């Protein structure tokens, strides 16, 4: 596998949402909008979901 073996939030290795763009691992409830189940399609972690790079 190519992402963390536990939720970056909990350090718990439950069902971890494999960020489609990066090796970040989270529980669907350790996100901003908690999910009742793993999303359909391209899911990105909070780290990847920032469109505006705050260079300043």
């Amino acid at each position: 596998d190519h992402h963390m073996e536990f939720c970056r939030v909990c350090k718990d290795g439950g069902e971890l949402l494999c960020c489609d763009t990066c090796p970040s691992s989270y529980h669907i409830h350790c996100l901003n909008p908690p999910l009742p189940e793993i999303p359909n399609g391209e899911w990105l972690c909070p780290r990847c979901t920032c469109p505006a790079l705050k260079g300043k």
Binding site: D1, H3, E5, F6, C10, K11, D12, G13, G14, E15, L16, L17, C18, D20, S25, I38, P39, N40, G41, E42, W43
Partner: peptide, 11 residues
Amino acid sequence: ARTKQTARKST
């Protein structure tokens, strides 16, 4: 969206 299941802190 993908998911892994490894070592969650149940034990």
